[PDB]
A = this chain, B = another copy of it.
Amino acid sequence: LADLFPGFGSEWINTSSGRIFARVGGDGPPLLLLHGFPQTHVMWHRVAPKLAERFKVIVADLPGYGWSDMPESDEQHTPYTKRAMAKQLIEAMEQLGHVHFALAGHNRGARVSYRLALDSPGRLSKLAVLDILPTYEYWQRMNRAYALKIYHWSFLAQPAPLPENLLGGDPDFYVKAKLASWTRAGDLSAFDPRAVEHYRIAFADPMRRHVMCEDYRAGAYADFEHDKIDVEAGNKIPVPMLALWGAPLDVWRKWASDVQGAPIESGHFLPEEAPDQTAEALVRFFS
């Protein structure tokens, strides 16, 4: 497994729920970067150096993902809810003395990030979300077309052990196919092979796959209900925020009072498919 973060250290950060693994590099204002599914912190490897020219960059594995410890889940999926994950990452950031920081997230990590912003806006100076809409919005959009496109939101949310059983036959296939299918190219050619190996190794562990299913179960149930409370109360994120998407601002303006955004010429995996454009947009925004 390759070290794809030149000039970054490696830290296990203690919390009350378990250690968070992170790569840490740079100097200046602090910036946390959160990956999603089916990836690890490594996804940020093409953009984190650019950001570290200006910021102290913390590139964390989500709770239960990568090298982070796996808290024990429960019937309501609680440690893998985005509220819970956000609380754990706030604790981790406190261990570093960061109580007000910038945050960028992608995929599940972006969901942690907007939930963090809704629950604890004082923690964030600025927020960026990469290629997502709020969980509530995806569920509200879940007609035939969406059910077919984002089938994994309901498949992975089926009660255990259904998805776990199926995934264990040929995990490597599935992860590689999901990586590829979500890119513009529809193959793996946008990824560094070393990064793909990180993703594959993580996905090969049944306990790590189980976490991912718990994350999607939370996405279908508690996360949805947490979002629904905010939409019903008319709550909006006050934190200055950037929404980037792969070629949404209308949607985010319903959720956030100070939001800007732009399409990036990319499939889903912006930091790997479009690293120069992504980095430039993030540096400009967070400066």
Contacts and interface: CB of A to CB of B under 8 A. Distances in A.
Interface string A135-148: 00001101110011
Interface stretch (A119-127, A159-167, A241-249): A159-167
Contact of A147 (B142, B170, B173, B177): B142
A224 B174 contact: no
Contacts of A224: 144
Contacts of A147: 142, 147, 153-154
Contacts of A220: 144, 148
A259 to B, nearest CB: 25
A177 to B, nearest CB: 7
A182 interface: no
5 pairs of A and B residues whose beta carbons are closest in the complex:
A169-B169, A151-B154, A139-B144, A166-B166, A147-B154
Copies in the complex: 2
A202 to B, nearest CB: 19
Given A165-B170, A166-B167, 19 more contacts: A139-B144, A142-B143, A142-B147, A144-B224, A147-B147, A147-B153, A148-B154, A148-B158, A148-B220, A151-B151, A151-B154, A162-B174, A162-B177, A165-B173, A165-B174, A166-B166, A166-B170, A168-B169, A169-B169
9 contacts: A142-B143, A143-B143, A147-B147, A154-B154, A154-B155, A166-B166, A166-B169, A166-B170, A166-B174
